[PDB]
Amino acid sequence: MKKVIGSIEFGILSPQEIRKMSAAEITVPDTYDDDGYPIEGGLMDKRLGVIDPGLRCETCGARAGECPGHFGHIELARPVIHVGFAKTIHRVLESTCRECGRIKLTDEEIEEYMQKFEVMGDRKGAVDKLIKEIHKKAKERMVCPHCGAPQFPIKFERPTIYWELRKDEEGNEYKHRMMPSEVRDRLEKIPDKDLPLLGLHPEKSRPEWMVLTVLPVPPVTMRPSITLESGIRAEDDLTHKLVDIIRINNRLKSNIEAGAPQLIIEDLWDLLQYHVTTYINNETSGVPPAKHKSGRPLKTLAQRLKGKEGRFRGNLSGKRVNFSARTVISPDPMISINEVGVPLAVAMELTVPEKVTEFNYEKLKQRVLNGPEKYPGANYVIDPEGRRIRLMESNRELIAEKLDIGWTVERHLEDGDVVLFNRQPSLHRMSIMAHRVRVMPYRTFRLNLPVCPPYNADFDGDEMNLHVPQTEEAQAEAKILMEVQNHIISPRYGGPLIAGIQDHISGGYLLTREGAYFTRYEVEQMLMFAGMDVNELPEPDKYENGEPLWSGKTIFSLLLPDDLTIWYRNKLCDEPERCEALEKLIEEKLIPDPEEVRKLAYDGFVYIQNGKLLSGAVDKKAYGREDGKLLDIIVREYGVERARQFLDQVTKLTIWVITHKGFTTAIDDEDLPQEAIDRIHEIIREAEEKVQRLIEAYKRGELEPLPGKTLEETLESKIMAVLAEARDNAGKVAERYLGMNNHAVIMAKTGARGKILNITQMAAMLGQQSIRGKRLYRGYRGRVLTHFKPGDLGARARGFVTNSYKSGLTPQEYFFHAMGGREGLVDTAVRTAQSGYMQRRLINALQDLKVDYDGTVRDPTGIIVQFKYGEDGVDPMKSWQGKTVDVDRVIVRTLLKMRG
Amino acid sequence: AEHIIDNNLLPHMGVDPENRRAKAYYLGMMALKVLELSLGLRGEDDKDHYANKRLKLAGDLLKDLFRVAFGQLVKDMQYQMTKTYQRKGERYTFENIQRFVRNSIRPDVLSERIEHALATGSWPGGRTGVSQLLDRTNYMSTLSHLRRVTSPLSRDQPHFEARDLHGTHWGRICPTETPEGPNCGLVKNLALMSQI
RNA sequence: UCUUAUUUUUUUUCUAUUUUGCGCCGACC
DNA sequence: ACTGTCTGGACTGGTCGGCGCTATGATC
DNA sequence: GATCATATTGTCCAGACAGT
Ligand SMILES: [Mg+2]
Ligand SMILES: [Zn+2]
Ligand SMILES: [Zn+2]
């Protein structure tokens, strides 16, 4: 049968257990001889395992690559204090009597502490608090309650040095060094009944085991030895540390057997203690770390376990996996959000293991008969007994003829196969989704554009990874849970994440704007491009020059479901009167006539009645990320598959619109007439005059301190406020003098790409350059640059750039903008590390929380963190703008459904 | 304590006790600098101001590396002559003092300390990354690497006052050409008009 | 003209089936 | 019972590519 | 000449601790 590890019990290894688990005794501080063979009794002994392929292990008889490795033991001449337990040892040394060995507590106190230990349960914090309280109470008693022997304070010196404060016959206070043998002898006197009071297990954590008498040398496999390209074997750091330990132990044994004086024995004991302490942890405080002959410090077991590169993080929590690829991504609007572009070279390398059944026997037989060099083919074949055979040209037909039910065929990646698509860093669960394999003959990955905002991935050389599940359970889990269309709504804010961006928004605005009409050929072409099932063209809206014309709203209406009705305001609202009139007309009748709506239709108010876009222009508020109301309603009211189809169709339609109608930006997009430039210059002169007046008022002393502030930062804040008002006025002038016919203004207003400030910065001014939230001050004495007078606090001398990008900046203003950009870049480069550390901390704090079947969130111990998740038991992904149920939307939709 | 004061307390003033009194004078000019800022007589100087910042070039690092290598070579030669005198004796040592000194020298012991520091980029005294592989991607990269300046500050440390551009970098440090990520600000390039 | 020692049967073959580590530098997301 | 001081730990992830190092002073 | 034992022992935040 099969068994799993139900629980793990920790403890301290006893010397008897170390001796029993050891397959050999190590006494030679060497690894290999001149010819390269292992030395008997050495660290590289075959009894501890084999790394070289030729050798065969003595203990288990297995060759390299399959021998698990066997531990050894070293009999230390003298006991050595374990550093990791050392401080804990001191605690026990402050809790037990030096003669009787019992704890320094009364019987009643011991019993009361036993009841306290039994009552509280299994919470770790209470146990540590009780242990600390018991240690503090026992450490202040100088008389043993059981024997009456006097006690002395014990001073702990890092890392493994113990001093006992003793008194001579003359009353002088001196320090006696407690040798590890004396410490172990004192620890041996503590009975098993007092161990729970000290936080030690009677049968698993005996204090005498905290002092090392037998050192467990690791197996050969866990510290492997390799041969370099120069023919010289490269030993591990642990091997060198163990060589030093064995040499020092042998020297100590020889000196002890020779009757060496006490000066020799304690010196060698200290050397062995230092070696063992470095072997346990080379980064111990208060000691010099062990270094190689080249001056490189070694990393021992503690550094192997801890750290980012340690076993826990670099090998256990996260590790490299098989059947994975990684390459650059390129855009592909022609594929669905469910599909990923897999290169042919990647597809012919990564293989899906498919078992031969009664329905896929012919397909897998054809895959085997194609071979690894022909697509679609196979690379490996596994028989039911379990031998894997690689398919070459010779046995390609023979294996195909031998194929039967129960065999496994590692076939090439085919269309429709489910694979994982992950981009690093993975800040959220939406950073990986299961896509469908689409095989194309190029070299790069291809990912659909609406799936990019979930990945936070652009196409400026982004690298993305792909993982192919092997087991059927993993493939099913990827297909059902982590499918792309199932994660359109972001659980972080309950809004659309998989959404149209940039050119999708621009094409939607171009199609759905007022006065946008298309010919019959254009309408048929966009219908075919978007893959819509429109068999017959709708009635044309108007006839121009004898030919029919279709409104873009009519074409957009075919995407929406026939029973959809929603009205809202978008970001293109600048005349609230028309929007208010439309809202009032909708409010009275609740089913306004389409002719009545079209009479007073406004691009700033989106209104869809029965799937017909009667008014409004498409922008980021329609199906953009974090703002699309239409996409949010479509996902929640019509499922995810219909939402995915709508997203694909609308993205293709908008791409067709933006491709053939013509979308471009030029140098005249930021061009302004002479009146706008004159107004901007007037604003500049007014701002500099106000700044100079403020400076003069501060100099003459009539400037008023702000409440709680002195002259300097008050004047600085006033100057910054004046410059901000000037920047706002310049931006308002630029917006006034730039119409909606501008493509850059279209992109800024519709929310496709960029902002209004971006156009303002390229046309009107750059504003004031600020560092760390204040004006630029770092530089020379009294000035930032030497081109200004010292002590000048003017706008031009402190980072206020008057000209824009189109007019070109002065060298001083260019330098100030460089300081601002450098500050921004440093801000992001500093923020990323802190954000990642905080994310890791939060994840490790909340990794184990899970909603149970009764709706309660509990920790693995059993403590109910929440009796109901979110206090209402509602998924934030399925929540409506952070609310439980959108009563307004439900009522309106139901009323419209019953009225229609 | 005498050795510590002689070899650690302002070694740039000397190591002999005779100049010790003068070191006290150098202490006094420190105390004033501490006192005035504690009393408002003088302002705090900028650590990132280039008047207080020097640029160790390849010559100074080569001088330090050659000093370390020559000291180790000197100690090796001293051990070699000591061993030769202890083995052969006074007769063979002083019969030809020209050959005795020459044979007690191992030049490679010096050489393998210099070029190795120019190979791995590790410098004596804990300094590392001094020597790097020259970038040969194109004509621009090699010139940028040859006109590159690094900082001893750690890359993971947020140095808001050090990574940001300074007003004294005009004409000395390029205001725009900086690397991204943790290397931003701490790694700069010399300006076209910069003279050292 | 003299003490204080003992004694026995139930185990088989000419031999064998895919280099880590350390540290540096640079770049990308 | 407060207060400044000493000691200890962590410092986002991933990827591409390169460079370079991992003996020696006696002994017959 | 060819071998061989030995090869040294930067900041910031939080918890514990003498001092008043
Ligand atoms: Mg990118
Ligand atoms: Zn084995
Ligand atoms: Zn006792």
Q: Both A274 and A241 in a single domain? A: yes
The residues near A500 (Cβ < 8 Å, ≥ 6 apart) are A449, A450, A508, A623, A624, A628, A647, A650, A651, A654
Instruction: Please check if A573 is assigned to a binding site.
Output: no
Give the domain CATH number at A407: 3.30.1490.180
Residues A456 and A481 placed together within one structural domain of the fold: yes
Q: Is the dihedral of CA A439, A440, A445, A446 positive or negative?
A: negative
Tokens of A470: 């092997």
Given A758, A787, A810, which residue is the final one in a domain? A810
The alpha carbons of chain B give a radius of gyration, in whole angstroms, of 24
Give the resolution value in Å. 2.5
Tell me the three state secondary structure of residue A372.
Answer: coil
The Cα angle at residue A707 between residues A706 and A708, in degrees rounded to 5? 105
Annotation-wise, does A147 bind a ligand?
yes
3-state class of B161 per DSSP?
helix
Q: In which residue are the tokens 């929590």 written? A: A317
**How far is the CA of A232 from the CAs of A32, A37, A56, A223, B82, in angstroms?**
11, 13, 21, 17, 33
Task: Tell me the CA distances in angstroms from A456 to A40, A350, A422, A462, A496, one per residue in order.
Answer: 59, 26, 11, 10, 14
- Same domain assignment for residues A306 and A329: no
- Is strand D within 7 Å of residue A294 (CB)? yes
Smallest Cβ distance to A785: which of B164, B170, B180?
B170
Of B158, B164, B184, nearest to A778 by CB-CB distance is B164
- In chain A, the N- to C-terminal Cα span, in Å, equals 64
CA distance A572 to A578: 12
Extract long-range pairs of B23-32: CB within 8 Å, 24+ residues apart. Answer: none
Experimental approach was: cryo-EM
Number of H helices, E strands in chain A: 28, 32
Q: Does one domain contain both A328 and A442?
A: yes
CA distance A776 to chain B (A): 9
Tokens of B147: 């006109």
Q: What is the DSSP annotation of A426-478?
A: --SGGGEEEEEEEEESSSSEEE-GGGHHHHT--SSS-EEEEE---SHHHHHHH
Distance of CA A652 to the CA centre of its chain: 32
Residues A155, A272: one domain?
yes
Q: Would you state the torsion angle of the CA atoms of residues A88, A91, A97, A98, taken in this order, to the nearest 10 degrees?
A: 60
A295 is near strand C: CB distance < 7 Å: no
Which residues in chain A have Cβ-Cβ distances shorter than 8 Å to B47?
A: none
Q: Is A142 helix (H, G, I), strand (E, B) or coil?
A: coil
Taking the C-alpha atoms of residue A620 and residue A287, their distance in angstroms, rounded to an integer, is 62
Tokens linked to A596: 């009545």
Q: Which bases of chain C are contacted by protein, using any atom under 7 A from a CB?
A: 18-29
- In angstroms, the first-to-last Cα distance of chain B is 40
Give residue A784's identity as a one-letter amino acid code.
Answer: V
Instruction: Classify residue A88 as exposed, middle or buried by CB count within 10 Å of its CB (0-12, 13-18, 19+).
Output: middle
Closest alpha carbon to A801 in A812, A789, A792, A787 = A812
What amino acid occupies position A669?
A: D
What is each CA distance from A604 to A374, A477, A590, A658, A748, in whole angstroms? Answer: 56, 44, 20, 21, 15
Q: For residue A780, which residues of chain B lie inside 8 Å, CB to CB?
A: 49, 167-168
Same domain, A184 and A110: yes
CA–CA separation, A119 vs A111, rounded Å? 12
**CA–CA distances in Å: residue A602 to residues A583, A607, A704:** 11, 9, 50
Cis peptide before A425 (omega within 30 of 0): yes
**Contact, B178 CB vs strand C, < 7 Å:** no
- Rounded distance between C-alpha atoms, residue A658 and residue A640, angstroms: 26
The whole-angstrom separation of Cα A618 and Cα A627 is 12
Question: Residue B177: CA atoms inside 13 Å, Cβ hemisphere, count?
Answer: 16
Chain B stretch 94-133, residues whose beta carbon is closer than 8 A to a beta carbon of chain A = none
H or E stretch covering A257: helix A237-257
- Count the residues in chain B: 196
Contact A489, A632 (CB under 8 A): yes
CATH number (domain holding residue A429): 2.40.40.20
Distance of CA A605 to the CA centre of its chain: 40
Asked if residues A880 and A890 have their Cβ atoms less than 8 Å apart, the reply is: no
DSSP-assigned letters across all residues of A566-606: EEEE-TT---HHHHHHHHHHHHHHSS--HHHHHHT--TTEE
Two structure tokens written together for B163: 């990574």
- For residues A799 and A816, is the Cβ–Cβ distance under 8 A? yes
Does A237 contact strand E, using a CB cutoff of 7 Å?
A: no
Is A216 in contact with A12 (CB distance < 8 Å)? Answer: no
Residues facing residue A38 across a β-bridge: A32
Q: Which long-range contacts (CB under 8 A, 24 or more apart) does A293-299 make?
A: A298/A237, A298/A238, A298/A240, A298/A241, A299/A237
Chain A residue numbers touching B167 (CB-CB < 8 A): 776, 778-780, 783-785
Give the pair of three-digit tokens for residue A448: 């659909």
Same domain, A575 and A645: yes
Let me know if residue A26 belongs to a domain: yes
Q: Which of A412, A427, A461 is the last residue of a domain?
A: A412
Q: Which two tokens stand for residue B95?
A: 């019969």
Domain holding A392, by residue range, is 351-412
Residue at A823 is within a domain: no
Q: Look up residue A442 and give its amino acid.
A: Y
Cβ pair B166:A772 closer than 8 A: no
Q: How far is B31 from chain A (nearest CA, A)?
A: 23
The letter for the amino acid at A515 is: G
| Domain membership flag for residue A499 | yes
Q: Measured between CA atoms, how close is A649 to chain B, in angstroms?
A: 39
Identify the helix (H) or strand (E) that includes residue A344.
helix A344-349
Q: Which residue has the tokens 């007769």?
A: B91
Sequence-ordered strand ranges (E) for A300-398: 324-331, 339-343, 351-355, 378-382, 388-390
Quick one: A402 and A419 in the same domain? no
Half-sphere exposure of A640 (CA within 13 A, CB side): 17
Q: Which residues are within 8 A (CB) of A376 and not within 5 positions of it... i.e. 6 or more apart?
A: A366, A367, A370, A411, A412, A414
Omega of the bond leading into A207 within 30 degrees of 0 (cis): no
Contact A244, A292 (CB under 8 A): no
Confirm whether A819 is domain-assigned.
no
Nearest CA to A395 out of A374, A379, A416, A375 is that of A379
Residues of A in Cβ contact (< 8 Å) with B166? 778-779
Please enumerate in sequence order all residues whose Cβ is within 8 A of that of B190, keeping only pairs 6 or more positions apart, or say none. B147, B148, B149, B172, B173, B174, B196
Query: CA-CA distance, A760 to A733, in Å (whole number)?
Result: 9
Could you tell me whether strands A324-331 and A445-447 are parallel, antiparallel, or unpaired per DSSP bridges? parallel
Q: Answer yes or no: do A690 and A784 share one domain.
A: yes
**Nearest one of A376, A366, A374, A409 to A390, comparing CA atoms:** A409
How far apart CA B150 and CA B142 sit, in angstroms, is: 16
CB A109 within 8 Å of CB A64: no
Question: Is residue A36 domain-resident?
Answer: yes
What's the rounded Cα separation, in Å, for the pair A793 and A775?
10
B181–A contact, CB cutoff 8 A: yes
Q: Which H or E run contains A815?
A: helix A811-845
Q: Kindly give the residue spans of alpha helices, DSSP state H, lying in A619-736.
A: 620-623, 629-638, 641-660, 674-700, 711-736
Question: Cα separation of A215 and A81, whole Å?
Answer: 11
Q: What does DSSP say about strands A339-343 and A432-440: parallel, antiparallel, or unpaired?
A: parallel
Give the Cα separation of B186 and A522 in Å (integer): 56
A823–B181 CB contact, under 8 Å: no
Distance between CA A336 and CA A451 in Å, rounded? 10
User: Within a domain: residue A829?
Assistant: no
Whole-number Cα distances in Å, A543 to A539, A553, A681, A757: 11, 16, 49, 41
Q: Is residue A870 in a domain?
A: no
For A822, the closest of B46, B49, B178 (CB atoms) is B178
How many other CB atoms sit within 10 Å of the CB of residue A817? 19
Contact A151, A98 (CB under 8 A): yes
Cα A113 from chain centroid?
A: 45
Alpha-carbon gap: B116 to the closest alpha carbon of chain A (Å): 12
Residue of A293, A294, A778, A828 to mutate, interface with B, max B Cβ within 10 Å: A778
Instruction: Give chain B's count of helices (H) and strands (E).
Output: 8, 2
DSSP, collapsed to helix, strand or coil, labels residue A237 as: helix
Cβ within 8 Å, pair B178-A779: no
- CA–CA gap between residue A385 and residue A49 (Å, rounded): 29
Measuring CA to CA, which residue among A51, A44, A47, A50 is closest to residue A59? Answer: A47
Tally of structural domains, chain A: 5
